Amino acid sequence: AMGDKAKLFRNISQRCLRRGSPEEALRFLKEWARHEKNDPEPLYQMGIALANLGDYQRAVTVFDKVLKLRPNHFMASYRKGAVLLKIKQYKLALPVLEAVVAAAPADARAYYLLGLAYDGDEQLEKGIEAMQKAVDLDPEEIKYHQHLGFMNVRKDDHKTAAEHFTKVMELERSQDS
Ligand SMILES: [Cl-]
């Protein structure tokens, strides 16, 4: 069922993304979409390009189109959640990211973005919960110890904050050796 036209445009879109030129890639992803309408994949790709170009509000709108077509499109929720966070729309990113983690309950990064969303919404305790899951799921990652440390600072538990920051540095000494 995939047209020759659709194949051509996909092919050109990929070269344009692979030569780091998403401005051009967009023009051709829109063509793929024109021909295979209701294929969510070109829309999903448009979303990615739009997010690299930093037109975040437009990227959310396209990710919503793909989610209207495939309500459980798990990557489409992931990336929507991740730009909703960058935009600082924390309240609206929370249900999205919480759905990603239900699909992918060992994805450390999902839980990190979730913690940052909760933290931004002044749900400090739920932010700590989530970041703690990310640290347990990937204890070598430095970012997750950094944030968990500061979250503990904000709650005036300077003991547990210290613990995490000491670990932050052990990781840093260990990335030269
Ligand atoms: Cl933080």
The domain segmentation of the chain, as residue ranges, is 1-177
Are the beta carbons of 128 and 111 closer than 8 angstroms? no
Closest CA to 108 of 142, 70, 151: 142
- What is the whole-number distance in angstroms between the Cα of residue 163 and the centre of ligand 1? 16
- What is the whole-number distance in angstroms between the Cα of residue 63 and the centre of ligand 1? 27
Q: What are the phi and psi torsion angles at 110 (to 5°)?
A: -55, -50
Are the beta carbons of 57 and 41 closer than 8 angstroms? no
Resolution (A): 3.4
Buried b (16+ CB within 10 A) or exposed e, 6-16: beebbebbeeb
- What is the whole-number distance in angstroms between the Cα of residue 155 and the centre of ligand 1? 11
Q: What is the DSSP letter of 149?
A: H
- Residues around the ion ligand 1 (C-beta < 5 A): 147, 150
Tally the C-alpha atoms within 13 A of residue 19's C-alpha that lie toward its C-beta.
9
- What is the whole-number distance in angstroms between the Cα of residue 74 and the centre of ligand 1? 26
- What is the whole-number distance in angstroms between the Cα of residue 13 and the centre of ligand 1? 37
> Which tokens in the block code for residue 101?
């983690």
The domain covering 1-177 belongs, at the CATH homologous superfamily level, to: Tetratricopeptide repeat domain (1.25.40.10)
> Which tokens in the block code for residue 177?
């050796």
| CB-neighbour burial class of residue 116 (10 A; exposed 0-12, middle 13-18, buried 19+) | buried
- What is the whole-number distance in angstroms between the Cα of residue 108 and the centre of ligand 1? 16
- What is the whole-number distance in angstroms between the Cα of residue 51 and the centre of ligand 1? 23
| CB-neighbour burial class of residue 19 (10 A; exposed 0-12, middle 13-18, buried 19+) | exposed
